[PDB]
Amino acid sequence: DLRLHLLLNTSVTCNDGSPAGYYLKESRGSRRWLLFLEGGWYCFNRENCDSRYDTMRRLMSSRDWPRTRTGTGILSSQPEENPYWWNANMVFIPYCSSDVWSGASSKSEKNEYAFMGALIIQEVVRELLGRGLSGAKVLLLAGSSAGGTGVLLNVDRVAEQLEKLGYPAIQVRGLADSGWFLDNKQYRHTDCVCAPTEAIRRGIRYWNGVVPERCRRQFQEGEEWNCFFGYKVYPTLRSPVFVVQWLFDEAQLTVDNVHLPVQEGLRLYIQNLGRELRHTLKDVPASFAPACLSHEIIIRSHWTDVQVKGTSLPRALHCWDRSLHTPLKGCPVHLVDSCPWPHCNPSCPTG
Ligand SMILES: *[C@@H]1O[C@H](CO)[C@@H](O)[C@H](O)[C@H]1NC(C)=O
Secondary structure, eight states, rough: OEEEOOOOTTTOOTTTBOOOOEEEEOOOTEEEEEEEOOOOOOOOHHHHHHHHHHOOOGOOTTOOOOOOOEEEEEOOOOOOOOTTTTSSSEEEEOOOOOSSTTOOOOOOOOOOSOOOHHHHHHHHHHHHHTTGGOOOSSSEEETHHHHHHHHHHHHHHHHHHHHHHOOOEEEEEEEEESOOOOOOOOOSSSOOOOOEEEHHHHHHHTTTOOOOHHHHHOOTTTTTGGGHHHHHHGGOOOOOOEEEOOOOEEHHHHHTTTOOOOOOOHHHHHHHHHHHHHHTTTTTSSEEOOOOOOOOOOOSSSTTSOOTTTEHHHHHHHHHOOOOOOOOTTTTOOOOOOOOOOOOOOSOOOO
């Protein structure tokens, strides 16, 4: 299991000012480090953050965190559950900043909550260097849902941080699971109070959110919300990033106001969503995108079960590792389903 360490720099906090932290399981012989960002939506004003504090407090505070957590999926230490990186050093970073890992603002006389996601990542990396990360060969920053978007927003900053700290030999890579969203038209209506473009636009100002520098320079002031959308931020990144995304992601459908006898309009909407997602992945060389209606994969215990074109995700990730040492015979890394309806892939999760 992974053991809790609260940050020694107690100025790097969860939303309510309690210290942020990480869960760690070291692997003495290993020079591989997996840092996983938890997900769980976000909040973007006083009223909706107050409601989140009432009923989702673990995502806003470390006060009730347990001393340990069990690693599952890519965080499992058993080769049977995790064929990919079972022997790596494992870190689970709880999501307690409600800011898609983008914030750099403290709780103060003017701020009821602290939004410190981007600083939590930097501080975890800094404190791990003294616990063995200084000897790393590869640091894989992974994450699911809001944590997957967090990978896209932070992977290059982790790389820059390690370079400036004097560790240019650590290879920083990203694994973004279920964080690749489309700013598409909703199937029906709008209400918010959501259209994620508007909520993210407000969140960035509420959180003092930060985005990767090259993306920020493209979109400029007032338009940094664009960098929260994978297909727009990905081309600006320098670190290798493997993208995992269900073609019919449940969170995407939720923000699109789709709630599942499907008639023609909704059928065409769903098929076009899968086609648009597939189009955005065409030039992403390392990707795994099954035609399923689901959400998240990499920390699920049965993550080894789904396959695209006969290749599982742990295999694709291993092939990615080999590619980062010309395509490899029978070891693909670009795996995007082409069939057009959820569960047209027989290996999709059953629910
Ligand atoms: C603690 O974190 C804050 C915010 O990231 C930073 O400004 C400060 O230098 C840090 N101090 C130490 C001792 O790590």
